[PDB]
Amino acid sequence: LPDLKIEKLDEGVYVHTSFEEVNGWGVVPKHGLVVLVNAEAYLIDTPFTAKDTEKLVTWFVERGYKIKGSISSHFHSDSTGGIEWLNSRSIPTYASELTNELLKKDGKVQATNSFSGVNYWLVKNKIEVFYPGPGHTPDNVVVWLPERKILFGGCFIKPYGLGNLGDANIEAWPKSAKLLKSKYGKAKLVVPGHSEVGDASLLKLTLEQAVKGLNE
Ligand SMILES: [Zn+2]
Ligand SMILES: [Zn+2]
């Protein structure tokens, strides 16, 4: 029910926030990014719905920023819900091979472009994809913007509680978070999927929460 939000975070970097009512959770916000590269837009995660995906795309297109592509950080609908709509508009969609395998298992439309293995450049030296290992989901990836030092952690970054454990790997999450913290300690900003933007301390807080959740 709250409207899509689009807010500038940094030069060429915007945070989009969409909202869903989730049974037992109440209203759940979902953050992704729009990243501008030579005045074209890349969507980092789609909103939950085709409606908010269209609103997001239109906001940029009507301002002269063509959509070059989207990438989805994991198979959950809060990262993937707009894939069908983007595909229908011939906008390239990206997801890991494993994310696409889990979408297909969940009866969902797949991204048209897949990648495997651990580091992938969506845009050489500008938008990097990294797989830290299983945590929130088996397939969760993070997106790094090296020129800005901004990490989109997505639903893997859980600084105050692990959220929905439905598809989580509570055994692997601590090792995965330790690796992410080691690689991205230099981050200026970490953008979580469900919590507000913070600094690199969110990598430590996620590790602390994963360690705490394995204990039970
Ligand atoms: Zn999720
Ligand atoms: Zn999520």
Residue numbers in the entry: 4 to 219
What text does the study give?
IMP-type metallo-β-lactamases confer resistance to carbapenems and a broad spectrum of β-lactam antibiotics. IMP-6 and IMP-1 differ by only a point mutation: Ser262 in IMP-1 and Gly262 in IMP-6. The overall structures of IMP-6 and IMP-1 are similar.
Here, we report the crystal structures of IMP-6 and IMP-1 with the same space group and similar cell constants at resolutions of 1.70 and 1.94 Å, respectively. The kcat/Km values of IMP-1 for imipenem and meropenem are nearly identical; however, for IMP-6, the kcat/Km for meropenem is 7-fold that for imipenem. However, the loop region (residues 60–66), which participates in substrate binding, is more flexible in IMP-6 than in IMP-1. This difference in flexibility determines the substrate specificity of IMP-type metallo-β-lactamases for imipenem and meropenem. The amino acid at position 262 alters the mobility of His263; this affects the flexibility of the loop via a hydrogen bond with Pro68, which plays the role of a hinge in IMP-type metallo-β-lactamases. The substitution of Pro68 with a glycine elicited an increase in the Km of IMP-6 for imipenem, whereas the affinity for meropenem remained unchanged.
